[PDB]
């Protein structure tokens, strides 16, 4: 969809910390994902058409495509859960983020029911 690409583009800037338009490892590790260095050079090698190794946004999306998505969203929630109870706390969301008051304002604005924490059934609503 035309919306989903724009959402990915905003996410792409969290990969493009330098702001130039070009790292994957740095954020992939920091997002708390084990997979080492060997596989990254191999994965980039499918979209880099000019050989430059320059990472461009149109490359990013195609590089992500496969020939199951519902479980990916559920796995994304598990990236927020440090322990894995079913709720995300202010201290949990602060971990993925790296002011504390701003994190509280961020937590409260998602909490639809009123528990002071964010569960999956409401984590999806925010995303779409």
């Amino acid at each position: 969809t035309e919306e989903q690409i724009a959402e990915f583009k905003e996410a792409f800037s969290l990969f493009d910390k330098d702001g130039d338009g070009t790292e994957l490892g740095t954020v992939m590790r920091s997002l708390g994902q084990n997979p080492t260095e060997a596989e990254l050079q191999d994965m980039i090698n499918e979209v880099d058409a000019d050989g430059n190794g320059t990472i461009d946004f149109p490359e990013f999306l195609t590089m992500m495509a496969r020939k199951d998505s519902e479980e990916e969203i559920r796995e994304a929630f598990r990236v927020f859960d440090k322990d894995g109870n079913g709720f995300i706390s202010a201290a949990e969301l602060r971990h993925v983020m790296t002011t504390d008051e701003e994190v509280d304002e961020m937590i409260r604005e998602a909490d639809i029911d009123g528990d002071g924490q964010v569960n999956y059934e409401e984590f999806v609503t925010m995303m779409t």
């Binding site: 191999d42 992500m64 994304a76 995303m127």
Partner: protein, 995 residues
């Protein structure tokens, strides 16, 4: 090759198709085939029925699309159209129903430009909002040549503002019948022509409520009082008085049908009337011309009907019957003055009655009147000089009467103090006739100044703003008219100053003045001698009998006869004394050497310019549709030049990349900051603004950040107005709305980024899976089947192959049978053609194995093989799994082979050398590229060279491995099956990959 606009002599533009193109010109075939230059040909709107309210909405912005858009709208009685915040108004020449109603007035209040259809009311409302919000006075300038609709639109504006923001408030409106009675007259161009310029100020208090107003008047036409053309009239009052006055008033003032008065009877003596209003006028009021030819026709003017409305207006604004009667008494006095003839000088016997009536109505002694018109002071006057005395008295009396009327009008709506004003400018419209005099010169000069102000404000300063702010808006050039203004008002050398000099020297001369003008501007772009005129109807005018000024609105030829006399405002002492000492109090109060009319005018107009420069300015550009005062007659060519001369074509051009709305970034941000939670406040100001513009509609192309001001594109006035709105709740609601949006972003950003990592990680597993699967297909021994069809110089052959591959050892064991008889080529030339997926890639090389990674779906191998000094092969091979066996289908074409060469003459030895093959990635095609030379041994001990060019691309769209540059080592052994009866080859090959 879509239809286009190209010039038309009377429509301005016509539709046609380009047929042939030259360097600077082309041919157009109308929808008769004709020549047009490239730069007078324009792209057309694809829908010829559609119209847009703002010309900036057009797909193509040019003078032709502009003309057509206005044409279509006028066809539907949509007389108003925008170019950004400027209004174009085409004179309908009929009353469009309800379009100016009080109900319509209310509907425009507080509404942003664009949210209602283009209207004079929206411009007036825009001026009000600007005044109220920016705390800055405002001026509405309504331009246009004669009869274009300036006075009518001026009235619509004044009516809007006073009805909308009044609460005695209708006096500014009710005043016009009075001013028009004394300042308006019939012309060939306009039945209700204004013969004076006016600036009507509506003053406001702190609460932005109307507290009163002020009318400034400029240069009333003086000569019209005494004489006019056969098709023109004196001021309406005379005819309104004669048509409508009671029999009582007629007797007291000794009035009769207009033909009886020298000051009326050289002009048109007919009344404006219809069937119904003709009956309401008595017979003793109607001239022989009226009786012979009927009334004059107009939808707005009606002499008898206007008299009543005037009397009603006077009563409505505070004028008592005493003052009404005083006014009428002076009017008739001036009339009777003109009926005084002279003979040799002395008053003629017949004009005795005229002297009595005039002296009585003007409160004068007969003997005193007779002497003042007849003698100079202390010596007697010639017949023609007495005429000059008579007419000069009439011109001063009527002029002072007019001054008194506007002054009396200003006293209806006075104000102690005001905060701001909205002023509406209504000058006399650009005009020209068969004979042009000082009247046209002064009027057209004033028109030049207005156009210069439009140029100054809309074309010069706008682009200076874009540049000072670094916007990079394409410059629009245009011809400026300041030179034309310089020619007229410059110190010492200007026409007005040269004219004043002429009045000053001992024996003044029109021709000495005219000569001086020409001599002092020898080669000037704006001045020429009458001999260079386009028309031949004015070619016999000598150099010192006139000049041409090339006005912005067109060249006008002036006859300079009577310029000197007309430039002098002064009245001689004996005439001045006579009238100042009238026994009539009213006439004494009318009056409270050389006085320059030109320089008094220039001073007044520059003081007006000072006013205008200090205000925010809005423009309404009025257009005359035709020359015959008819409705529904759009004359394209005539309207086109008005659009060009007005500068609207230049403006439309600028708006292709221009920005009509702008605000100070610092000011805009700070007014929202006051409501920002202290968190959002930390956010980069520019980012907040971007989020705010998003929240109120705008896309990124709709606005631009300059160095200090943020600019907004055409057609976005409502959005702009919402952004700028100062209301606390509105600023709080918006801040809340963007605050929410930023939290929704920050969430979605880290949310989608988490999904991004999940997908990246998933893709990695998806690559490995696929490559493992490919690799696990080749763990053990794998059966092969090969099929080739070949054509070599017309020799068609087929071969079938079978055997097995062992990728662990890199071993190929294959037997090929030619099923079609003898092979037309030597077997060795087919060895490289006769499943690289069976190559040995050792431990640390497995990452470089494209061939296995494409499996089971496989790949296409394409080769060109060049046999040096001989022909070439082209091969296409399709290699993939088919169950547990690897299959390969090949097509081969050979051409250009020498029939007695090594290939077709079978001179190659049945053996094979070892070779290295250099593999590299073909990044663009997602496969590999290969280059190698095979050396084949010739019987006599020489070598046949075979140059190979190879490309492999995968069949499926699944993931494959793209390798680092590496090479494959081949060993090949050729042998024969001792029991095989058919033509054949047994091939044994070993292949290892290496660094």
């Amino acid at each position: 090759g879509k239809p286009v606009w190209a010039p038309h002599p009377t429509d301005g533009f016509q539709v046609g198709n380009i047929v042939d193109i030259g360097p600077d010109s082309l041919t157009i075939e109308p929808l008769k085939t004709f020549l047009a230059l490239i730069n007078q040909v324009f792209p057309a709107e694809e829908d010829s029925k559609k119209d847009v309210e703002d010309n900036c909405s057009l797909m193509y912005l040019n003078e032709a699309t502009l003309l057509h858009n206005i044409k279509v709208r006028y066809s539907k009685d949509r007389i108003y159209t925008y170019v950004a915040n400027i209004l174009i108004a085409v004179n309908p020449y009929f009353d469009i129903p309800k379009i100016y109603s009080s109900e319509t007035i209310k509907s425009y209040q507080g509404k942003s430009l664009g949210t209602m259809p283009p209207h004079v009311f929206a411009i007036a409302d825009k001026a009000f909002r600007d005044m109220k919000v920016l705390k800055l006075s405002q001026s509405i300038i309504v331009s246009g040549e004669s009869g274009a609709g300036k006075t009518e639109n001026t009235k619509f504006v004044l009516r809007y503002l006073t009805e909308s923001y009044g609460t005695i408030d209708d006096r500014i409106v009710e005043a016009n019948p009075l001013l028009e009675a004394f300042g308006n007259a019939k012309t060939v161009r306009n039945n209700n022509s204004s013969r004076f310029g006016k600036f009507v100020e509506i003053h406001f208090n702190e609460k932005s409520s109307v507290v009163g107003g002020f009318v400034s008047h400029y240069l009333l036409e003086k000569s019209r009082i005494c004489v006019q053309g056969k098709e023109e009239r004196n001021y309406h009052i005379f005819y309104r008085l004669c048509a409508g006055a009671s029999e009582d008033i007629r007797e007291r003032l000794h009035l009769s049908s207009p033909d009886n008065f020298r000051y009326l009877n050289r002009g048109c003596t007919r009344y404006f009337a219809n069937k119904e209003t003709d009956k309401q006028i008595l017979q003793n009021r109607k001239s022989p011309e009226y009786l012979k030819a009927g009334s004059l026709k107009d939808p707005l003017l009606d002499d008898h009907g206007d008299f009543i409305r005037m009397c009603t207006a006077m009563k409505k604004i505070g004028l008592d019957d005493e003052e009404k009667l005083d006014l009428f008494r002076v009017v008739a006095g001036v009339l009777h003055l003109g009926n005084i003839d002279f003979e040799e000088c002395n008053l003629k016997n017949k004009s005795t009655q005229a002297l009595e009536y005039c002296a009585e109505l003007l409160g004068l002694d007969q003997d005193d009147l007779r002497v003042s018109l007849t003698t100079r002071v202390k010596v007697p006057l010639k017949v023609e000089q007495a005429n000059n005395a008579r007419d000069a008295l009439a011109k001063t009396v009527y002029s002072h009467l007019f001054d008194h009327v506007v002054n009396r009008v200003n006293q209806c709506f006075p104000f102690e103090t005001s905060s701001y004003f909205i002023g509406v400018l209504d000058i006399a419209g650009f005009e020209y006739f068969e004979h042009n005099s000082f009247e046209q010169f002064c009027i057209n000069y004033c028109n030049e100044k207005l156009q210069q102000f439009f140029n100054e404000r809309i074309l010069k300063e706008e682009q200076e703003l874009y540049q000072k702010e670094g916007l990079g808006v394409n410059e629009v050039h245009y011809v400026d008219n300041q030179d034309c203004i310089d020619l007229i008002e410059a110190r010492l050398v200007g026409i007005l100053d040269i004219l004043d000099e002429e009045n000053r020297l001992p024996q003044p001369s029109d021709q000495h003045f005219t000569s001086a003008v020409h001599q002092k501007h020898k080669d000037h772009f704006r001045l020429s001698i009458p001999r260079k005129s386009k028309l031949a109807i004015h070619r016999n005018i000598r150099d010192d009998e006139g000049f041409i000024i090339r006005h912005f609105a067109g060249a006008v030829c002036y006859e300079t006869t009577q310029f000197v006399e007309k430039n002098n405002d002064a009245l001689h002492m004996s005439l001045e004394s006579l009238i100042c000492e009238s026994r009539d109090k009213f006439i004494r109060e009318l009056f409270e050497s050389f006085i320059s009319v030109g320089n008094k005018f220039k001073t007044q107009l520059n003081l007006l310019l000072d006013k205008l420069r200090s205000t925010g300015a809005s423009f309404i550009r009025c257009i005359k549709p035709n020359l015959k005062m008819t409705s529904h007659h759009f004359e394209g060519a005539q309207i086109l030049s008005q659009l060009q001369c007005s500068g609207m074509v230049s403006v439309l051009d600028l708006m292709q990349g221009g920005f009509p709305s702008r605000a100070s970034f610092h000011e805009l941000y700070n007014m929202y900051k006051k409501y920002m939670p202290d968190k959002l406040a930390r956010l980069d100001p520019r980012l907040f603004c971007k989020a705010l513009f998003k929240a109120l509609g705008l896309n990124e192309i709709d606005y631009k950040f300059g160095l200090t001001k943020v600019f907004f594109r055409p057609g976005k006035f409502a959005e702009f107005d919402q952004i700028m709105k100062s209301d606390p709740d509105h600023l709080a609601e918006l801040v809340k709305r963007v605050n929410h949006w930023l939290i929704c972003s920050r969430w979605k950003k880290v949310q989608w980024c988490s999904l991004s990592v999940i997908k990246l990680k998933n893709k990695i597993k998806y690559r490995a899976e696929a490559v493992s699967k490919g690799e696990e297909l080749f763990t053990g021994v794998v059966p092969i089947l090969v099929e080739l069809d070949g054509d070599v110089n017309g020799h068609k052959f087929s071969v079938s192959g079978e055997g097995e591959g062992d990728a662990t050892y890199g071993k190929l064991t294959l037997k090929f049978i030619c099923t079609t008889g003898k092979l037309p080529v030597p077997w060795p030339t087919l060895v490289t053609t006769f499943v690289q997926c069976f190559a040995r890639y050792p431990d640390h090389m497995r990452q470089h194995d494209f061939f296995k990674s494409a499996m089971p779906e496989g790949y296409v191998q394409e080769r060109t093989i060049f046999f040096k000094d001989d022909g070439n092969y082209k091969t296409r091979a399709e290699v993939k799994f088919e169950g547990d066996t690897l299959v390969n289908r090949i097509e081969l074409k050979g051409i250009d082979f020498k029939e007695d060469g090594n290939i077709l003459g079978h001179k190659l030895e049945y053996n094979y050398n070892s070779h290295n093959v250099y593999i590299m990635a073909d990044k663009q095609k997602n496969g590999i590229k290969v280059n190698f030379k095979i050396r084949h041994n010739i019987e006599d001990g020489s070598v046949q060279l075979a140059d190979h060019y190879q490309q492999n691309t995968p069949i499926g769209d699944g993931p494959v491995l793209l390798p680092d540059n590496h090479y494959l080592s081949y060993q090949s052994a050729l042998s024969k099956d001792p029991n095989e009866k058919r033509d054949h080859m047994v091939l044994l090959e070993f292949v290892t990959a290496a660094g």
